[PDB]
Design a binder for this molecule. Structure first.
Ligand code: MET
Ligand SMILES: [Cl-]
Ligand SMILES: [Zn+2]
Ligand SMILES: [Zn+2]
Ligand SMILES: [Zn+2]
Ligand SMILES: [Zn+2]
Ligand SMILES: [Zn+2]
Ligand SMILES: [Zn+2]
Ligand SMILES: [Zn+2]
Ligand SMILES: [Zn+2]
Ligand SMILES: [Zn+2]
Ligand SMILES: [Zn+2]
Ligand SMILES: [Zn+2]
Length: 260
């Protein structure tokens, strides 16, 4: 059933995220510590997948969300006829291709070793699906019949030398699929929960137009007339500190790269 989540409660500012494992949420404890003197309590709704946080925000269940990149936001707004806005950039985490697993060993240590007739899992939402497909193309596994800013779908695969089966799954399910596929494209959000080591990935998305993959803090367009606007501006100030910069780098082991 849709919208699985839990809450993590410390003026009160409610933030929707997607749950991450290990130390990756420590940025939020540091931000809370910074805005404490200002009288601000943060409360988090932590969803399990990318379909829910923007809806929570447009519906007024939360004040902010922090989970997506600009492309995901733009696409979600267009699809849903909404106009949530980015009010700060956070980090970039270039998406990676990971080997399928045999127990806890990687089956492959190079792209070239993916077998003919193999299966690769990719996210199934338009922007991360596209992102994964361009990744598979830059890794030399496929060619696409779209380019530039065109969203690629699986129907846009033009060449497929190894006859790979490309299976699109929920973004939150690609890392879990690694026990039974040859390779998967996995968003940073899901890496730690599956116990993956991002530094042992087969392939990393190439920098270039990289800003479209920048993560953001998002609110409703009229947030600035809200009684919570002052508190929101302080939270943003706390995120954009040297202290938080360091916590993100340390608590994610470098997986998330701050962009401010
Ligand atoms: C919901 S869009 C995906 C965001 C994810 N943190 C990424 O940068 O890959
Ligand atoms: Cl805390
Ligand atoms: Zn709830
Ligand atoms: Zn709550
Ligand atoms: Zn929790
Ligand atoms: Zn959590
Ligand atoms: Zn915490
Ligand atoms: Zn906390
Ligand atoms: Zn409610
Ligand atoms: Zn409600
Ligand atoms: Zn899809
Ligand atoms: Zn598709
Ligand atoms: Zn490592």
């Amino acid at each position: 059933m849709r919208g699985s989540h839990h809450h993590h409660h410390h003026t009160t500012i409610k933030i929707a995220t997607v749950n991450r494992s290990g130390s990756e949420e420590k940025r939020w404890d540091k931000i809370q510590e910074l805005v404490k003197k200002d009288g601000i309590t943060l409360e988090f709704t932590e969803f399990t997948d990318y379909s829910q946080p923007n809806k929570a925000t447009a519906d007024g269940e939360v004040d902010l969300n922090a989970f997506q990149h600009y492309n995901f936001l733009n696409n979600w707004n267009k699809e849903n006829g909404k106009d949530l806005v980015a009010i700060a950039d956070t980090y970039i985490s270039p998406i990676r291709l990971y080997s399928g697993l045999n127990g806890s060993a990687n089956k492959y240590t190079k792209v070239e070793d993916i077998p003919a007739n193999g299966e690769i899992a990719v996210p199934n939402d338009a922007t991360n699906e596209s992102r994964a497909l361009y990744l598979l193309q830059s890794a030399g596994l496929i060619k696409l019949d779209v380019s530039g800013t065109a969203l690629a779908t699986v129907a846009n695969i033009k060449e497929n030398p190894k006859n790979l089966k490309i299976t699109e799954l929920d973004a939150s399910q690609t890392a879990r699929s690694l026990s039974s596929v040859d390779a998967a494209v996995v968003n940073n959000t899901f890496v730690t929960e599956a116990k993956l080591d991002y530094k042992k990935s087969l392939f990393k998305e190439q920098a270039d137009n990289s800003k479209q993959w920048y993560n953001i803090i998002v609110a409703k367009k009229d947030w600035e007339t809200s009684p919570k606007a002052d508190a929101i501006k302080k939270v943003i100030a706390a995120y954009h500190t040297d202290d938080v910069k360091k916590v993100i780098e340390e608590s994610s082991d470098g997986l998330d790269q701050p962009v401010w």
